[PDB]
Design a protein around this ligand. Structure first.
Ligand SMILES: *[C@@H]1O[C@H](CO)[C@@H](O[C@@H]2O[C@H](CO)[C@@H](O)[C@H](O)[C@H]2NC(C)=O)[C@H](O)[C@H]1NC(C)=O
Ligand code: NAG
Ligand code: NAG
Ligand code: XYL
Lengths: 146, 719
């Protein structure tokens, strides 16, 4: 039975900065970030890369929604960099390479935090990060499996 | 607290284009206070390890600056998989694509080469011959079914029609791959789950086990390249996933390589997809690898084996759905065999290699269009009906069993269950008659027919009629599995494997079935039986000590195969209340369900309950006990009294047991009909080789349905 790091109510920028550094749950636990159904940049107002936190807490702020989604530091970094590396001009792109080099610099600031833990035992369906109960024929916030 | 990040200045030669919009009045005096939101803009507040001494920077970018066959979907938008990566724990709690230290995946023989793009030892699935029709799965007659090895169905409209699909690796450590899926194959039990996803030009395969880390293989067109995504240490260029070098049509990638053999198996697995295009060549090697399993792990999981087995089956489904599209047709005999052997292998893999119990095995094949499948299954149901009425052939009734097996439905198993029981009965009469049940056509029939009489136990909760029918089939197959048949079945299998090259000459387990694998005999791997199997063996070039070890391993395969929890559970009478004392639970060596109410059990130790007999004249080191179990906590020791015979003596229903001083049980024959009762009342006529006489010094017992066991003096054979 499995868990989520729910979104945070965030009407103002301080509603986010207030939030303390996420502690990492036990190896016991099967948790997952609650991220947006889809990543739309015309719908993201601020990106909080708080790499001073032991867990690289990154927050995605959607102001209209008044939610801040805490997401996978590393895959967000990787993905967002990629999206910036796309050619899609010269000002447009020079700005982009700028923001790129500055993100990449801070990420490498923390490249020693990436896990070395080998992926653990048990059945998978359909994600290592989902639950690992074996289902057969005779068949920090909760989301009991179906 | 006080936040005062270093916004840049339009002048900055570097981060200058990232200065905040004039609108904001972001002066050094204002930047606390927050109030960083600007509609047309997205800001990024970066902070590093040295916070607060380094207050981190606040960057500004206008939102607008952010806005054929097998393709990687890269980035966060508009990648459908993005969300699933962002939710993952990848690199937070696991490393699903660890640093490879010279980890190497050598090219392999049989591995597709520029010369043979299908495989060196490939034997391609042939095309429907010139000007052969391709019927729909609706006008399917019993005549079609008989000439089925030469009846072609057109794949278009039967096969799942390809449609776009995004594959997310479970590792969340690779970019989502966009494909045209051709369906998939998935199977597992209460202790393992394997899931293959097929796409044109691609396969996605996850093997998982309860007590072992997973394995992942991703097969793609040879010119594609999959990076490991999200590891910050690959900032310059992303770290391409480990894997074998690229073949002629496919390049294979792997996640979660390591522990010696785990790596080995995984090399074999990454090798499988490029080796053949014939779903059969995989099946064959699967059934062969299953007979080679080491006896040592017992009923525990064997991760090495299971990976190899699961990869073979997933790979065969890949060759099958591929071959189909290829010449746009499926031979009806191949459809049926693929569905049958899929079902058969998935069970042998889960039971023998994943450590599971048959009552939990499942298998969802979905290469077919769903609507066409329902139609096919409905028609097949009807032909199962027809066959049992119209046709008389043994070939036909065995096709009817195998069809029920593929349907795996109660209705199906219903029509054919009486037929199967009646056949089993007929073979016992052939064997009591003196004949051997060795013709491949016969074994294949015996295979599915026992499968059929067993099916209700695996689905849970059988009827009184269903239990009775299977109990008799078990008394029979146990009788069919004498010591002699056992030794023989070792010689036949050894000879069968010898003949196979896994291409021109395949190895289908069902065609080499023996009663032994569907008996209630679990003593087949004991000392006395290995000797039998060896003295009736053909000399080879293997050291004596090894051929003996190879034998014990196959002995063990057949006993493990035959051992179904659900049946033992059902034919060993337990009491209605708890029995005082520590249960001395001895696992039955032989189980004889002699009446619906009661059973005899053969063990190496007295049980604490039941009428218990201790066989006499048997080597003290390897003793034999026969216990009569009923729903009761009571036990009595009893001596085995001697008796002679001599029109109805009341022998019918009783069971004839021959055993040696060596402590070996030679035959557990069911006294079936009256003819068999008279064949017994005469004695052992000299020069009349019944199944009731042996040339081996041994003692003869008769076990009555009512709990009494006697000593048939006349059938003893002294030295
Ligand atoms: C269980 O059934 C058998 C049936 O043969 C019984 O054996 C009988 O025992 C008597 C004793 O004198 C003998 O005449 C024969 O050996 C048997 N009679 C018959 C009917 O053939 C055995 O005694 C029965 N045991 C129980 C517990 O009832
Ligand atoms: C920013 O500050 C300047 C100078 O004090 C002032 O003229 C202007 O009104 C301010 N702009 C906004 C949007 O408040
Ligand atoms: C079934 O079980 C009961 C209790 O064990 C026994 O007394 C009875 O003889 C059995 N019935 C038949 C039909 O043999
Ligand atoms: O003997 C084998 C049986 O299956 C066990 O349940 C107990 O030993 C009965 O006493």
């Amino acid at each position: 039975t499995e868990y989520v790091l729910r979104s945070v109510i965030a009407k103002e920028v301080g509603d986010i900065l207030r939030v303390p550094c996420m502690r990492t749950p036990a190896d016991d636990v099967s948790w997952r970030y609650e991220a947006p159904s889809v990543i739309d940049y015309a719908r993201i107002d601020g990106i909080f890369l708080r790499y001073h936190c032991p867990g690289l807490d990154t927050f995605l702020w959607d102001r209209h929604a008044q939610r801040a989604y805490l997401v996978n530091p590393f895959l967000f970094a990787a993905g967002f960099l990629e999206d910036l590396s796309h050619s899609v001009d010269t000002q447009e792109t020079t700005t982009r390479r700028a923001l790129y080099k500055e993100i990449r610099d801070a990420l490498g600031s923390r490249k020693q935090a990436v896990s070395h833990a080998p992926v653990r035992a048990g059945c998978v369906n359909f994600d290592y990060s989902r639950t690992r109960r074996c289902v057969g024929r005779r068949d920090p916030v909760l989301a009991l499996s179906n | 607290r006080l936040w005062l990040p270093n916004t840049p200045d339009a002048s900055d030669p570097q981060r200058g284009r990232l200065a905040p919009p004039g609108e904001l009045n972001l002066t050094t005096a204002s930047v606390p206070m927050l109030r960083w939101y600007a509609e047309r803009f997205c800001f990024v507040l970066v902070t590093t390890a040295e916070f607060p001494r380094d207050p981190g920077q606040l960057l500004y970018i206008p939102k607008t600056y952010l806005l054929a066959e097998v393709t990687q979907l890269k980035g966060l938008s508009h990648n459908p998989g993005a969300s699933a990566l962002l939710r993952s724990r990848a690199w937070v709690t696991f490393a699903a694509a660890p640093d490879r230290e010279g980890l190497t995946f050598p090219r392999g023989d049989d591995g597709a080469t520029e010369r043979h793009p299908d495989g060196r030892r490939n034997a391609p699935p042939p095309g429907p011959p010139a000007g052969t029709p391709r019927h729909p799965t609706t006008n399917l007659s019993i005549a079609h079914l008989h000439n089925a090895s030469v009846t072609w169905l057109a794949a278009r409209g039967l096969l799942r029609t390809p449609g776009r699909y995004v594959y997310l690796s479970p590792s969340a450590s690779t970019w989502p791959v966009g494909v045209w899926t051709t369906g998939g194959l998935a199977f597992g039990c209460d202790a393992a789950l394997v899931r293959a996803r097929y796409g044109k030009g691609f396969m996605g395969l996850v093997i998982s086990m309860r007590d072992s880390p997973p394995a992942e293989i991703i097969v793609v067109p040879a010119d594609k390249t999959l990076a490991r995504v999200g590891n910050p240490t690959d900032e310059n260029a992303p770290a391409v996933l480990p894997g074998p070098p690229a073949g002629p049509r496919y390049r294979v990638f792997v996640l979660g390589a390591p522990n010696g053999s785990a790596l080995d198996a995984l090399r074999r697995v990454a090798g499988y997809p490029e080796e053949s295009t014939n779903y059969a060549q995989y099946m064959s090697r699967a059934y062969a690898e299953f007979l080679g399993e080491d006896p040592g792990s017992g009923t525990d999981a064997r991760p090495s084996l299971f990976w190899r087995l699961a990869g073979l089956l997933a790979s065969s489904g890949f060759a099958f759905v591929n071959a189909a599209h290829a010449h746009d047709a499926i031979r009806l005999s191949d459809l049926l065999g693929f569905l049958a052997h899929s079902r058969v292998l998935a069970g042998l893999a889960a039971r023998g290699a994943a450590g599971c119990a048959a009552d939990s095995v499942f298998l969802n094949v979905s290469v077919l269009d769903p609507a066409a499948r329902l139609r096919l299954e409905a028609r097949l149901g009807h032909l199962v009906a027809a066959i049992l009425e119209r046709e008389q052939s043994l070939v036909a009734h065995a096709l009817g069993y195998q069809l029920a097996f593929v349907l795996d439905s109660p209705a199906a198993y219903g029509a054919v269950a009486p037929s199967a029981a009646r056949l089993i009965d007929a073979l016992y009469a052939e064997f009591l008659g003196g004949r051997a049940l060795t013709a491949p056509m016969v074994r294949r029939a015996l295979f599915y027919a026992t499968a059929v009489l067993r099916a209700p136990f695996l689905a849970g909760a059988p009827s009184a009629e269903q239990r009775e029918r299977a109990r008799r089939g078990l008394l029979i197959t146990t009788a069919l599995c004498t010591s002699d048949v056992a030794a023989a079945t070792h010689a036949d299998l050894r000879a069968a494997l010898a003949r196979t090259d896994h291409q021109k000459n395949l190895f289908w387990l069902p065609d080499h079935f023996s009663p032994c694998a569907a008996s209630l005999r679990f003593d087949l791997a004991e000392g006395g039986f290995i000797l039998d199997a060896l003295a009736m063996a053909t000399r080879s070039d293997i050291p004596a000590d090894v051929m003996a070890q190879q034998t014990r391993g196959v002995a063990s395969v057949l006993t493990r195969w035959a051992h179904y929890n659900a049946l033992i559970r059902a034919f060993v009478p337990e009491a209605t209340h708890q029995c005082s004392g520590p249960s001395h639970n001895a696992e039955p060596r032989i189980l004889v369900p002699i009446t619906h109410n009661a059973s005899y059990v053969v063990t190496h130790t007295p049980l604490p309950r039941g009428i218990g007999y201790k066989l006499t004249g048997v080597d003290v080191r390897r003793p034999l006990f026969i216990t009569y179990l009923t729903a009761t906590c009571e036990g009595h020791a009893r001596e085995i009294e001697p008796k002679r015979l001599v029109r109805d003596l009341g022998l019918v229903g009783a069971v004839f047991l021959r055993y040696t001083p060596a402590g070996e049980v030679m035959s557990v024959l069911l006294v079936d009909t009256d003819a068999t009762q008279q064949q017994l009342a005469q004695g052992p006529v000299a020069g009349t080789p019944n199944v009731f006489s042996s040339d081996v010094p041994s003692v003869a017992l008769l076990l009555f349905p009512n709990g009494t066991v006697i000593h048939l003096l006349a059938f003893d054979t002294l030295p």
